[PDB]
Each structure stands twice: as structure tokens, then as C-alpha cells.
Amino acid sequence: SMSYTWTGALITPCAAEESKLPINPLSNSLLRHHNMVYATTSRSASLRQKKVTFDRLQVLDDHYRDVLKEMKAKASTVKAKLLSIEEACKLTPPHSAKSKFGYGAKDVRNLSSRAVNHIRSVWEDLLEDTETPIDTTIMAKSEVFCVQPGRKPARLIVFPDLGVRVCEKMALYDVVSTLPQAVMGSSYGFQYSPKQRVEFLVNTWKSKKCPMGFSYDTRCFDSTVTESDIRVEESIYQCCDLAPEARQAIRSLTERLYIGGPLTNSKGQNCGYRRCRASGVLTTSCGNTLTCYLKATAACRAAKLQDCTMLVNGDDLVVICESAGTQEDAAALRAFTEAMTRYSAPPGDPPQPEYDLELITSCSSNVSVAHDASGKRVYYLTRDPTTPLARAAWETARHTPINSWLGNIIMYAPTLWARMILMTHFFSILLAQEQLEKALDCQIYGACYSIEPLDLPQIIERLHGLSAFTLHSYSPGEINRVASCLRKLGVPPLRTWRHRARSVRAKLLSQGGRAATCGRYLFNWAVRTKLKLTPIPADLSGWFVAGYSGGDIYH
């Protein structure tokens, strides 16, 4: 079937839409080629629509069915509870989009009588009505990038009203937080902290006689997902032990929301109909992860690849296996791609087999190595820092709701760029406005978190260990990528950052505790006299459990 159908009516914005990085003394200190940085807008919506709208070919076989049953067997071990209204309400972000029926996120979070009663209605409606399609809104995402030597069109997000999103959580939060791990086991990506992810990739790599590995980029995954795929995904959820009201909710949400529905623009006009994954519902991450894992797992058998270990994060996929010789590896990977095409998951760019772990890009990241205080090799996780930096400039010049910089500091703390540029730049600013204490919103695996910068030393210690404060002797491939990037974007070269860092470090020391602890630990790479570095005195229990991208989750 057609992934989408369009009435012709436009995909509209609901506010002013900003697209150019402004000239600001704060952002210009970080990066100077301001005309290279842009945000996507709805002005580019039609270009995306063209890309996402197509006919899907899908043909299932024995291998598909075989893996599906294996997955269903493990799903049967799961007991899942209903959240109460209170729990589901406490999971709603404070800046989540308001309802059409006269209540917002603040009301939901307070359990105001109005929100609560509409939530009860929507739920009872899900128990009573098993067919009527449920309305969605469609909007062009605002995202920041650097120009390519050639712009990206905005992404399209699609989501139901707030009353439904609370009901999704009641019915499905426990499932989408526990079912993926029981089914995929060590292949479920979102269980791993960055240090744990690198551990798993290195251990898996070093466990093979002759490793070969590849990433596989599916072309616009959400549009490849068929109605069949979403019913199959429901067949997995239904293997859980569920309360009756849960089971019916899941059934109605599947037929009325997840498989498709009408699309409405911001002006209340009808844009079209959807027959694929919606980016903006609770089950997208779980569902995409399961679906990716299922097709890829079956395609591996079809391709005859040997001793496969896969690692899956929604629609991001990486596979490590036993080489069969370079040319036999190439023909097997091509068989794999073709199997996936049949399962309705064709490639964006053809995958290439790799024989050096550092050359594989999964979740926009790659493994690299450095050395700690005592000279031991420490494997860490990094990426091309262009987008982080472009966004960091943008978030310095403009107030955004989510601060990608802070999320990038946490995730990439041990990296060369995050340490010398991000920490330096942002801590210098927070000092100068006396806002070190103030908590800021960031995203980790799609969930929203309110973190305060003064907690970054211990957060980084837990997530990465003391070494993220003492790494040195980075590889030249990595130093070269960073240095080039900076020249391209007009970011000052690293020696400038070193000097700015020393000035910032000295200022944090002459402050107090905590602040000085930032100075001591975060900026020990800058100072002349190297320092002690003992563990730091000071709940991270729910941080790397599951993915929630598009799922409207706050913790």
C-alpha cells in the first residue's frame, strides 16, 4: 500500500519559524561562519513528503516466521501492569503539547479535575470503540544542521492529542519499557550506557576469529513499516500477561492509531492519510526496534552470514559476524540487503563490510581509543562533531526547549571536542550569568531530563568512570576530524580553547565546593600541574533501560 495519501492541503506551522543563526557575541565566540548553520522549516515540507510517500513491496517467508515465533516465545515470559492515571500523568513532560479539549501539560501533571475526566473519557472510548480512526496532527520538525557542499528537508512528526498519549502510557508504558529486553536480550541497545555499549562492541568484536561488521541504513524506516508489520508487532505485545482493559486498549490503539489514520495540519484542515509508522506515539521506539530486529535477524539467516551478533536501537542497526573471506563477505552482505528489501526495508545507501571496528558508524557514533592517567588503553565512543557544534551555537544564540549541548556533554564526556570546546564554552557562559545552579532540560534516549550542570562531574563518573577526566593521546584520525571540522565552521582552533579553559578553571576554583569540583575534574586536562583525582562522594537507575523517542516521556 501507499505510505501516505495527500489531499493537497499544506503542512502548516503553528508559530513563527526561525531559520538563520543570528549574529550574537556569545555564539560568535564559539563559531564564526554563522551562515553555514540553519534550522529546517515547514517551507521544505513538500520535499520530504515526496521522499516519504511510496508504494511498499513486502513478501514474508519461512525465516521471517521462524524468528517471529522465537521472539513470541520470549515475549510470553512478560507480565505487564497498567499504570494508574497518576503515574501516567507524572510521566508527561511539562512542555508537552496541550489538548484540543481545553487543558494542557501543567493540568495533566496536577491531576486537575478537567484533564482527569477527559482522560477517563478517552480511555473508556478505547474500551468501547474498536474501529474509528483517531485523529493525528502533522507538523514539520525544527532541526539544526551545517550546510553540505545542500540542505536537508524538515522531518515530519505525527501525533495524537494529549488525552490519547496519557492513555498510551496507562496501557503500554510497562510493556515498551520491558518487552524489548526480554525478546532481544543483549541486542537491545537502549539498555547500555555509552561505556557499556563500547564494552559490548569491543567484546563482541574481539570474540570473533575473523570479525567483519556493517551498519545498515534503511531508507526512511517509518515509511517502510507496513500495516502487516504493526499487527505483527501487536501479536508480540499480546503474548504478555495483560489486564483485560489493557488488552482491549492495545487492540483498539493498534487498529485506530498505530496502523494509520487521518492527518490534520495546524489549521484544522485535512492533509491526508497515513499507513505507516507515526513518529510521535509511545510504541515507535519499541516497535521500530522489534521490527528492525526481526527483519534483520531473518535476513542474516537468508544471507547465510555466520555467528551474527546484532545491536539494535529503533531503526539503527549494526551487525558483527565471522568473516568468510572478503569476496564471500561482499556477496553475503548483498544477499542480506536484498532479503531486507523483500521484507520492505530497503537500503538508503548500500552497506559496506568493514574489518576495523573504528570504521563502523552505529547511532551516528564510532569507537575510538585513547589512554588514561596510567597509560592504559581506554575505548570510548565519539562522532563527527559538526552537528553538535552547529546546534551548540544555535542554542547559545536562541533559547530552545531542549539543550542538545548538555545531552551531548553527558553522552560524549570523554571525547576531545566535548571536553575542550563544549564544557569550556558553556561553563564560561554559566559563570558569567551566575546560572550554574539552574537546572536545564535535555534528552537521553528520547526521554526528557531536568539536569543541573553542577552535577556533571558525578554523572560523568558513573556513566564513564574517572578516565573521562584524564584521557589523553587520542588517535590522529580523531584529532584530524575535529581540527578539520573547526576550520570548516570557523570555530577557534583547540589551543584557543585550552587558554579559555585555564581562565574558566581558575574561576571555578575560587567559587566554592561543587563549582570547584567542576573545575578540578572537568578541566584537569588544561592545567599545568596534573592532579590527584579520587572518586567523588555522591539515582541513575532508570537512565539506560529503554528508548522513548517520540514517546512524550519525562523523568
Side-chain angles (χ1 to χ4, degrees), residues 197 201 213-217 311 315-319 349 352 354 356-367 381-384 412 481:
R197 180 181 179 89
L201 284 167
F214 59 100
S215 52
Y216 185 87
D217 174 30
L311 183 67
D315 73 10
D316 204 285
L317 168 67
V318 64
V319 172
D349 7 60
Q352 297 287 301
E354 292 284 355
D356 179 12
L357 182 69
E358 318 186 59
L359 292 173
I360 293 170
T361 311
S362 64
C363 300
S364 329
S365 307
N366 73 265
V367 179
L381 199 53
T382 188
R383 54 167 294 152
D384 184 298
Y412 290 107
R481 185 168 60 194

Side-chain angles (χ1 to χ4, degrees), residues 71-242:
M71 291 169 64
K72 293 177 76 169
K74 300 176 230 134
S76 320
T77 72
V78 175
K79 213 205 219 237
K81 62 141 178 289
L82 284 179
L83 263 55
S84 57
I85 306 225
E86 175 168 26
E87 298 163 280
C89 290
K90 266 72 237 272
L91 290 176
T92 301
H95 302 312
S96 202
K98 55 170 189 197
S99 181
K100 287 173 229 195
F101 308 96
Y103 62 85
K106 61 186 153 50
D107 306 291
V108 161
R109 286 188 71 83
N110 297 156
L111 318 153
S112 103
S113 190
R114 158 92 157 178
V116 170
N117 289 333
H118 284 68
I119 291 165
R120 296 217 191 261
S121 307
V122 171
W123 179 262
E124 186 55 48
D125 190 80
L126 290 182
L127 301 182
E128 280 159 24
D129 188 334
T130 73
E131 308 195 351
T132 305
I134 285 171
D135 190 51
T136 54
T137 309
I138 193 169
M139 293 291 291
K141 205 177 213 316
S142 215
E143 289 193 301
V144 170
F145 298 103
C146 169
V147 171
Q148 299 298 301
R151 284 186 180 68
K152 303 196 187 175
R155 277 203 267 147
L156 297 168
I157 70 251
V158 168
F159 60 96
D161 168 90
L162 172 65
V164 176
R165 301 201 302 275
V166 182
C167 290
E168 286 194 83
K169 297 163 166 74
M170 290 197 283
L172 277 155
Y173 178 87
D174 198 26
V175 170
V176 299
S177 310
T178 52
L179 178 133
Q181 244 266 77
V183 179
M184 291 169 284
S186 68
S187 287
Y188 183 56
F190 300 111
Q191 76 192 293
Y192 299 125
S193 80
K195 159 95 282 160
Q196 288 159 348
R197 180 181 179 89
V198 152
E199 174 165 66
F200 183 79
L201 284 167
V202 163
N203 289 351
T204 302
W205 185 263
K206 288 186 161 53
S207 83
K208 308 300 179 178
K209 292 173 282 164
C210 199
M212 181 286 283
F214 59 100
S215 52
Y216 185 87
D217 174 30
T218 305
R219 188 187 171 273
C220 301
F221 191 86
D222 285 356
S223 278
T224 73
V225 179
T226 59
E227 301 168 276
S228 174
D229 289 329
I230 294 155
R231 288 191 263 249
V232 166
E233 159 186 347
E234 187 210 350
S235 84
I236 296 164
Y237 304 152
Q238 291 280 354
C239 293
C240 300
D241 185 76
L242 292 167

Side-chain angles (χ1 to χ4, degrees), residues 50-94:
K50 178 141 285 148
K51 173 115 90 128
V52 304
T53 298
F54 51 95
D55 236 273
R56 279 81 61 80
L57 96 309
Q58 182 173 69
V59 170
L60 310 181
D61 62 0
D62 287 339
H63 281 129
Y64 179 96
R65 284 185 288 270
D66 281 357
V67 182
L68 178 49
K69 291 171 194 188
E70 292 171 18
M71 291 169 64
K72 293 177 76 169
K74 300 176 230 134
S76 320
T77 72
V78 175
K79 213 205 219 237
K81 62 141 178 289
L82 284 179
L83 263 55
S84 57
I85 306 225
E86 175 168 26
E87 298 163 280
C89 290
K90 266 72 237 272
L91 290 176
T92 301

